[PDB]
Amino acid sequence: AKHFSGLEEAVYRNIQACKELAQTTRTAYGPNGMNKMVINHLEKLFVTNDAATILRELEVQHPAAKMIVMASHMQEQEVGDGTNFVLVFAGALLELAEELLRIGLSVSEVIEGYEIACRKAHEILPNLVCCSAKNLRDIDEVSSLLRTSIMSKQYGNEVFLAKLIAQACVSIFPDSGHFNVDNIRVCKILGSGISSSSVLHGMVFKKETEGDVTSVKDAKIAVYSCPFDGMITETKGTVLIKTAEELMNFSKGEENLMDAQVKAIADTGANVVVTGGKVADMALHYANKYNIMLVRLNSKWDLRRLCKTVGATALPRLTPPVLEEMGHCDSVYLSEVGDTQVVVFKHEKEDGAISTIVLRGSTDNLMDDIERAVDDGVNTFKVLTRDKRLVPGGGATEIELAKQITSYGETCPGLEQYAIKKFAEAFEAIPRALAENSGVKANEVISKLYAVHQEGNKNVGLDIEAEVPAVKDMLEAGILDTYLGKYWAIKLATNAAVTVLRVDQIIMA
């Protein structure tokens, strides 16, 4: 990177990164995220209530943050919630090592104290679980589980999208014996109401739906990024712009030049023919008269999700479609997924792993927020598959973590005692994170989480009731995480963070 000096990184960069990485977990997590305008290299306002999403959109110059940001993304992989929850425990504890460095303790010492303590905290978490819930075919339970996952990272529709993802995350697998990496594939169409956002299944091309329905049942596709303009690899499909004498030949010939096109397509078999390219005038006339369905002007994301679900190859060179240019679906039924007339395929048993949630609203910021939700419900539903387990949500469990690590810190003596003394509190940043967006008092909520010892119950979330600190049961709040989701975060809030201080300065000319 840049040439540095003075061993500044540790005492400066390492503490700089996480807090700079923070506020994305702190004023956004738990019951609600707070929006952050994000303008990427393409300028539009982007709403991020998730830390990973704003970390996705934060290009990391730090050598230090470049370690922790990725592992903070890896929780959106592994959980989908608590990706915020990575950085709040990560750097807070990490910050507590600098004053341990003020104590004089060596860098590797206090980090080892964090490992043995998080391994200890890894022991504490599953004890802190309150019962469990799993039904992978059901909306209600799943929505109550996923809702914390969206709530942290969503300021918008919670139960409604919890239900719609608990629809979708389920319904794409009509019964989930498990859940894939990602099944639900959203067809993104804005407008109407933001609650006009619906859930269907299969692939939707929001580009030109053209040709005509040849078979509504058999959706069999010939997928091409290729223009059907007469462009094709068997003959010369040249459009003739040279002279009016020339173009009339294309007018006469494109009926025939689309004839070597649709039939080289449909004779090897097809019904829908997915066009990432275009279809010419007399081509479309011929394709409309031959009545071959050509979905046209399709995006990659159009071409791709199809090739992602049925499996397929959309190629710019036209040719007889192979069964890897030929997919089959449940049905191609021209219909509206959330109030826009488009071709909508159907995939569950045939291929599957595609579920359209049309994400609607006034602006794509109203799409992006509800895009956070359904996605935050995607990942944690696979989390809901891997365990039925439900921990009381963020900030209620944290004292049993803190309380024991305190007494564990009390059993610590040996110099990492103070370091595990640091490890104990860093869970109480969770009520603090949920305090400071609330604007309420951390240490008093932390005290409201101590003296009563409700230990998996008392927490202040992010509410319209957050004017005054009120410790509410997260177990009943509809906000429930899982020890795995915890353990994944409690691992990945440590690893990158505990290893980021172990570094020394960058040495360059």
Binding site: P63, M67, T233, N495, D504, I507
Partner: protein, 513 residues
């Protein structure tokens, strides 16, 4: 042009020398911290390895040329010790600088370093005792020498999987490790791990049922040039350009696909029979569905996308050799690995070539996506294996924890070679520079680098005791008994490379530019 003479020039010499090196002392034992070098490309890194962060990008010095040279000699030749090596090279300058401060000539200081380097190198054999090629005795020297590169944990997981690899050798006297370094990783949600895997294992293969899954006689035709070409050891060009040129290759591809399976089936007909013995074509490009069936359906194993790194660890392990084509390789030249077995877990399809006639290769499968996970273990793999290989090839390994450093400067105690100062000045600076290894660990940890040492010294001055600074808490301990022993191949390459460069700087007087 400009003239910078002697002390003016030798300052920039000694200033640039110990300028990086003193900060390089953040690494030794497990307790020495980790330094992060980020090269200009932006790679976040951790190596307690002494030499590594130098050679890539560093503060540019005149001595930067020499420090990259001598930091090499330790890990290049032996494979371990640069964490303990680079630190001594200017550790011997620190004391001599104070001796030169008397007006004591750079040459009279030059001749001195070479003097007692003998005595300590003599003492390395003197101090070392023959230590077994045994698993745990390796593990012991491992637990030392591994940490004399990097931190405990990854060295501690490299205290087992490594000791096996250097043990798993067919037999090898190589001080470093080549083919039993096989770097694979399955990016893994959990933090980290290194999966020790015996024999060569292919990064990718194609395991299809009509093939031989478990192959007891596996005769390998190594294969690269695809079913898309005909009797060639390198691929030719493509035509995407013209529509009629697009119809030329895919139609004629039937000529190319079968021409290869023609050889492939008959070479199985020849060598392997059909259902009797398994045949293997390891196809290091993709495999077309005709022969991917026909290679299978004949009984041949067709292994897709093997790396050349596999291909070389294929040959010597199996005893056969490779080929670049899908056409006939000689039955002898056919690689025979008594087990060709493709195991698929998670992201990658791993083809075991096992019952190796002479396995020179094992495989280490790393875990986790994060570079903060990988760069720590990745950089310790090379220095994990070769280090413990120095324990197996040499039954002689020198005890660690500087208990050897304290056990010389006490015998080296000033004016045992009493003749004069100038040679003594070296052996004096040298006796004092010896002690860094105890010091730097007690520099990392508490007491003092002295308070522990002066106790260590005394504790060693107490007879019958080889004692050293704890590799973690910076406190007294017995290097022999605790089981911390440096590689003697590290330890000889320790004193040579350190003392020569400083001496090379000591004849340096005027720098010109």
């Amino acid at each position: 042009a400009e003239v910078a003479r002697a002390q003016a020039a030798l300052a920039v010499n000694i200033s640039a020398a110990r300028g990086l090196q003193d900060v390089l002392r953040t690494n030794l034992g497990p307790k020495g911290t980790m330094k992060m070098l980020v090269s200009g490309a932006g790679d976040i890194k951790l190596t307690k390895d002494g030499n590594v962060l130098l050679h890539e990008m560093q503060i540019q010095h005149p001595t930067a040329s020499l420090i990259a040279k001598v930091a090499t000699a330790q890990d290049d030749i032996t494979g371990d010790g640069t964490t303990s090596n680079v630190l001594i090279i200017g550790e011997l300058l620190k004391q001599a600088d104070l001796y030169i401060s008397e007006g004591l000539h750079p040459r009279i200081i030059t001749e001195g370093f070479e003097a007692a380097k003998e005595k300590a190198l003599q003492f390395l054999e003197e101090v070392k005792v023959s230590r077994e090629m045994d698993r745990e005795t390796l593990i012991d020297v491992a637990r030392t020498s591994l940490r004399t590169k990097v931190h405990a944990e990854l060295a501690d997981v490299l205290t087992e999987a490594v000791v096996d690899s250097i043990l798993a050798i067919k037999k090898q006297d190589e001080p470093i490790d080549l083919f039993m370094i096989e770097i694979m990783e399955m990016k893994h949600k959990s933090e980290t791990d290194t999966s020790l895997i015996r024999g060569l294992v292919l990064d990718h293969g194609a395991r299809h049922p009509d093939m031989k899954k478990r192959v007891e006689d596996a005769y390998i035709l190594t294969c690269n040039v695809s079913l898309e070409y005909e009797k060639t050891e390198v691929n030719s060009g493509f035509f995407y350009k013209s529509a009629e040129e697009r119809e030329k290759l895919v139609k004629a591809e039937r000529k190319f696909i079968e021409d290869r399976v023609k050889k492939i089936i008959e070479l199985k007909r020849k060598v392997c029979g059909d259902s009797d013995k398994g045949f293997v074509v390891i196809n290091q490009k993709g495999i077309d569905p005709f022969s991917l069936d026909a290679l299978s359906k004949e009984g041949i194993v067709a292994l897709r996308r093997a790396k050349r790194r596999n291909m070389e660890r294929l040959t010597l392990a199996c005893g056969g050799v490779a080929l670049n084509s899908f056409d006939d390789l000689s039955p002898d030249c056919l690689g025979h690995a008594g087990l060709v077995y493709e195991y698929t877990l998670g992201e990658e399809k791993f083809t075991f070539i096992e019952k190796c006639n002479n396995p020179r290769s094992v495989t280490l499968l790393i875990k986790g996506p994060n570079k903060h996970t990988l760069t720590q273990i990745k950089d310790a793999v090379r220095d994990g294996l070769r280090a413990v290989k120095n324990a197996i090839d040499d039954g002689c390994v020198v005890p660690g924890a500087g208990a050897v450093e304290v056990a010389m400067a006490e015998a080296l105690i000033k004016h045992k070679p009493s003749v004069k100062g100038r040679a003594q000045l070296g052996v004096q600076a040298f006796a004092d520079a010896l002690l860094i290894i105890p010091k730097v660990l007690a520099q990392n940890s508490g007491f003092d680098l002295q308070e522990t040492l002066v106790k260590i010294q005394a504790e060693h001055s107490e007879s019958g005791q080889l004692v050293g600074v704890d590799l973690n808490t910076g406190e007294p301990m017995v290097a022999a008994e605790v089981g911390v022993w440096d590689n003697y191949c590290v330890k000889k390459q320790l004193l040579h490379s350190c003392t020569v460069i400083a001496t090379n700087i000591l004849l340096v007087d005027e720098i010109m530019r």
